[PDB]
Design a protein around this ligand. Structure first.
Ligand code: CA
Ligand code: CA
Length: 197
């Protein structure tokens, strides 16, 4: 009742905490691979940094669910998503939060892109039009939002609107369509993706 939900049954906070706890149990199987993948994009992070980075993707990849529309659709089977895609809104917050925490535009981009693509099956179109389709019904985050982020990541999205998210996502989808990297970009995003699920 009245909680920011991941699923009808589950609060998003509880769901995130379960994914994080589970990350601790497997991370040492994945950390080296992720570190060296980042290193093939000339991004240099030690093992503990890579861990923090992964925890943020874990915590934020479904933050888009705190959209009022998403929350409505979970509680009520009269309200429908209407093409709304939470991950685009997740990608937006992930990017700004990564940029703050690590001060590396490429890392924040790659993290946000992973989050923007966390629903495509592993080893994974991007027109401005489609962005507009997938954000059409976006009508802001829930009221508790700022507090929710604090609970999740420990600070304030105050300290760092719909059309702003549209602009960001379009700008993202483009710079991602354009890379020759493709086979590699798919492998790096593909690499960060596995641990998420
Ligand atoms: Ca998701
Ligand atoms: Ca998942």
């Amino acid at each position: 009742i009245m909680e920011v939900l991941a699923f009808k049954n589950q609060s998003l906070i509880d769901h995130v905490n379960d994914m994080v706890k589970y990350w601790e149990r497997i991370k040492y199987r994945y950390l080296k691979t992720i570190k060296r993948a980042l290193e093939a994009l000339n991004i240099k992070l030690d093992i503990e940094k890579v861990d923090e980075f992964m925890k943020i993707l874990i915590k934020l990849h479904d933050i888009g669910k705190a959209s009022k529309i998403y929350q409505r659709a979970i509680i009520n089977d009269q309200e429908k998503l209407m093409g709304f895609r939470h991950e685009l809104v997740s990608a937006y917050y992930t990017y700004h939060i990564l940029l703050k925490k690590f001060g590396d535009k490429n890392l924040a981009f790659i993290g946000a892109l992973t989050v923007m693509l966390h629903h495509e099956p592993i080893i994974m179109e991007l027109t401005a039009e489609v962005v507009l389709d997938k954000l059409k019904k976006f009508d802001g985050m829930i009221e508790d939002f700022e507090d929710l982020i604090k609970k999740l990541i420990g600070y304030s999205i105050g300290d760092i609107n719909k059309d702003d998210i549209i602009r960001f996502v379009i700008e993202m989808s483009v710079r991602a369509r354009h890379t020759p990297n493709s086979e590699k970009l798919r492998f790096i995003v593909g690499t960060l993706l596995l641990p998420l699920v």
